[PDB]
């Protein structure tokens, strides 16, 4: 009836963009547009990931699966809308859909990731004791807003 | 008088992102507003290079500095203004400057002579032939949608 961790996936410089908070009420769905990181780029790779650090590869990984033949575009400019959808079983359907060419993907992955109740409780208390070090990135970020 | 090769920051994920293209007349001033990566950054490092490539570390280290002591905020929220200052002669005052707060650093760079013609057109010729391979990230980035 509740997500026990969150869910998201990997973006550019391994930042955990979280789509599902820890806690949500199930079922529920929700999805965000992405782009490209680089010129002239023609796939982008959806690595599905559960937990709560900011550092994707820190935690979980459940999916991974590419959306292939964007056609060319300077960065940033692509849309490729992301939808996470779970459930009344929990079931998390992930897809990606690029919205110039319409070519979709999608995935589905068990209730919770597979994990037990004490496993779940490790990755909490583990995100708990890690949270500054993450904090010590030193990266400049320039925003990529898509507004016309 | 011109740049002969681009020059910018290094940001998020490894990306050159070019605040005074190749070819610019000089003297000139450039400035462009970036943000930290994670939530509670306290830090953030000026990576200035020199080159064509969209890989950062591809292209040649000029200087490097940081601001430390930004409040902790959500990712994205502070606003550090960087600013390529470049004299007639390629020299480069290169500052950064938290809005927030006011407090910021400077380096002082030559961009010039320091590389032959035959070097800089190289350096233009390989970023040419390596600009393919760049193209091959498959990374998303998060992206707004914001009127100004």
């Given at each position: ?34 782009s490209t990181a ?14 709560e650090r900011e ?76 949270a500054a070090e ?15």
């Amino acid at each position: 009836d509740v997500t026990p961790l969150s869910l998201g996936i990997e973006t550019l410089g391994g930042i955990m963009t979280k789509l599902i908070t820890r806690n949500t009420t199930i079922p529920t769905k929700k999805s965000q547009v992405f782009s490209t990181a680089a010129d002239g780029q023609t796939q982008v790779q959806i690595k599905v990931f559960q937990g709560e650090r900011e550092m994707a590869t820190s935690n979980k990984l459940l999916g991974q699966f590419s959306l292939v033949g964007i056609p060319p575009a300077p960065r940033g400019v692509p849309q490729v809308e992301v939808t996470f959808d779970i459930d009344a079983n929990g079931i998390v359907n992930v897809s990606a859909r690029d919205r110039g060419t319409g070519k979709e993907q999608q995935i589905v992955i068990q209730s919770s990731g597979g994990l037990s109740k004490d496993q779940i409780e490790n990755m909490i208390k583990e995100a708990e004791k890690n949270a500054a070090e993450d904090a010590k990135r030193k990266e400049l970020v320039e925003v990529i807003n898509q507004a016309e």
